[PDB]
Scaffold this active site. Structure first.
Site, PDB file in Angstrom:
ATOM      1  N   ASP A 268     -27.829  32.066  -5.909  1.00 42.22           N
ATOM      2  CA  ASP A 268     -28.177  32.751  -4.657  1.00 42.22           C
ATOM      3  C   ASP A 268     -28.314  31.581  -3.687  1.00 42.22           C
ATOM      4  OD1 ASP A 268     -29.494  33.882  -2.446  1.00 42.22           O
ATOM      5  OD2 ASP A 268     -31.316  34.433  -3.574  1.00 42.22           O
TER       6      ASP A 268
ATOM      7  N   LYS B 128     -26.968  28.109   6.724  1.00 40.79           N
ATOM      8  CA  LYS B 128     -26.367  29.432   6.473  1.00 40.79           C
ATOM      9  C   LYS B 128     -26.203  30.210   7.783  1.00 40.79           C
ATOM     10  CE  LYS B 128     -26.837  33.363   3.420  1.00 40.79           C
ATOM     11  NZ  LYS B 128     -27.554  33.875   2.232  1.00 40.79           N
TER      12      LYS B 128
ATOM     13  N   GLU C 291     -25.031  39.929  -1.712  1.00 38.58           N
ATOM     14  CA  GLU C 291     -26.428  39.837  -2.169  1.00 38.58           C
ATOM     15  C   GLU C 291     -26.968  41.226  -2.584  1.00 38.58           C
ATOM     16  OE1 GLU C 291     -28.292  37.759   1.154  1.00 38.58           O
ATOM     17  OE2 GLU C 291     -26.984  36.041   0.755  1.00 38.58           O
TER      18      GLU C 291
ATOM     19  N   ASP D 128     -34.514  44.077   1.711  1.00 38.18           N
ATOM     20  CA  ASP D 128     -34.554  42.632   1.638  1.00 38.18           C
ATOM     21  C   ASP D 128     -35.322  41.989   2.779  1.00 38.18           C
ATOM     22  OD1 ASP D 128     -33.959  39.902   1.291  1.00 38.18           O
ATOM     23  OD2 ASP D 128     -31.842  40.264   0.782  1.00 38.18           O
TER      24      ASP D 128
END
Ligand SMILES: Nc1ncnc2c1nc(Br)n2[C@@H]1O[C@H](CO)[C@@H](O)[C@H]1O
Ligand SMILES: [Mg+2]
Length: 390
Positions: free
Chosen positions: A12, A73, A177, A201
């Site tokens: 991840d 990211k 994800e 999330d």
């Protein structure tokens, strides 16, 4: 005949933290790094003598903010002119430069000014995750599944593969994800018939809601929604402002202009925030916080809940929007899955469970580990090369 194959890993590659797992002996092992941490900061720091990655990088951020890179990211696969990039740059202490409308992070490193593409910084994080896995397995690792947000486009997915290739990894697949979190619970192994799954999330800085439909192990992304301005750091901020006010009332002193004091306060606030997920109260004890004054206090879970109440309630807006977009009613959701450390907050869990009329939440796999867990499950499946019997 045929030499034993090395295990493949699931990574991840997170915005704030990364996590690595391996599927062996019919189960997933989430691999701790050599500081004993099951998640590793997605940080890279540069000095005159070293390049530090993970905990070593995050632990020296206070005095080296210009040369400690995090949040790569948020830049990966984006143009320098992208409005998201332009806004994010105002919050970062490190320099982001324009190279042919492609962002690069610019730092001081080993006596020189050096600029890196976001995929190069991410390759450094991936190299650390590979080494963490190799320290546990006791052999070199080649194959990996890497996850990305469901909303990542082609450029963002290719730049993530590029980061894996720079790190010397063979990227088996880039997987979403939310899909990996569903795989972690075996939600693609329930047989024939459609299942609607909602992934909730809540990260350090962003909140993502995804609705997936699973039919005979096939995943379809039905809707994505979220809040780019909602995360764990906002709850830390509410505690910071509260304790700054408290120090003012109690000692008639404003600490807010001593960066060290504010930082020590924020660090203690985040730990108190974690304690409040398991306890109904938490002490806060800081020696010589400001002007040699010791700050020894406490906060109840009820006061913390009141401080962040509007923020916690706002997680239900993207849930309702995602359900409208998927054209589904809340009763039509078969499974609820929690992802992100901030989902351990009891009040966040209660608000969501109450919204879904008392339904159970899948939270048995550590929410900061579920994505890597699913990626590790898939990596083991992808390297199988069984030849059918007659
Ligand atoms: N037990 C926990 N209770 C509340 N929050 C937590 C917990 N554990 C983690 Br991890 N977090 C938060 O998750 C985010 C991950 O980037 C950060 O904001 C962490 O503070
Ligand atoms: Mg994540």
């Amino acid at each position: 005949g045929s030499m034993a194959k090395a295990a493949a890993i699931g990574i991840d590659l997170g915005t704030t933290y990364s996590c690595v797992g391996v599927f062996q002996h019919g189960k997933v092992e989430i691999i701790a790094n050599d500081q004993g941490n099951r998640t590793t900061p997605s940080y890279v720091a540069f000095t005159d003598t070293e390049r530090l990655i993970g905990d070593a990088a995050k632990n020296q951020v206070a005095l080296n903010p210009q040369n400690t890179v995090f949040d790569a990211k948020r830049l990966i696969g984006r143009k320098f002119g992208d409005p998201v990039v332009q806004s994010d740059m105002k919050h970062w202490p490190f320099q982001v430069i324009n190279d042919g409308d492609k962002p690069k992070v610019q730092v001081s490193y080993k006596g020189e000014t050096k600029a890196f593409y976001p995929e190069e910084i991410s390759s450094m994080v991936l190299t650390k995750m590979k080494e963490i896995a190799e320290a546990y397995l006791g052999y070199p690792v080649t194959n990996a599944v890497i996850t990305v947000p469901a909303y990542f486009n082609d450029s963002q997915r290719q730049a993530t593969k590029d980061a894996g290739v720079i790190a010397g990894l063979n990227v088996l697949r880039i997987i979403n994800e939310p899909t990996a979190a569903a795989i972690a619970y075996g939600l693609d192994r329930t047989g024939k018939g459609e299942r609607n799954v909602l992934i909730f999330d809540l990260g350090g800085g962003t909140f993502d809601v995804s609705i997936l439909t699973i039919d005979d192990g096939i995943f379809e992304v039905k809707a994505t929604a979220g809040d780019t301005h909602l995360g764990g750091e906002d709850f830390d901020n509410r505690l910071v402002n509260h304790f700054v006010e408290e120090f003012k009332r109690k000692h008639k002193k404003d600490i807010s202009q001593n960066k060290r004091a504010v930082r020590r306060l924020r660090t203690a606030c985040e730990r108190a925030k974690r304690t409040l997920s398991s306890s109904t109260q938490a002490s806060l004890e800081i020696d010589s916080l400001f002007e040699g004054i010791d700050f020894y206090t406490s906060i109840t879970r009820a006061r913390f809940e009141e401080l962040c109440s509007d923020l916690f309630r706002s997680t239900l807006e993207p849930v309702e929007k995602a359900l409208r977009d998927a054209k589904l009613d809340k009763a039509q959701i078969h499974d609820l899955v929690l992802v992100g450390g901030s989902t351990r907050i009891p009040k966040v869990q209660k608000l969501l469970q109450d919204f879904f009329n008392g339904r159970d939440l899948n939270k048995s796999i550590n929410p900061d580990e579920a994505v890597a867990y699913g990626a590790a499950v898939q990596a083991a499946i992808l390297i199988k090369s069984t030849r059918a019997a007659a």
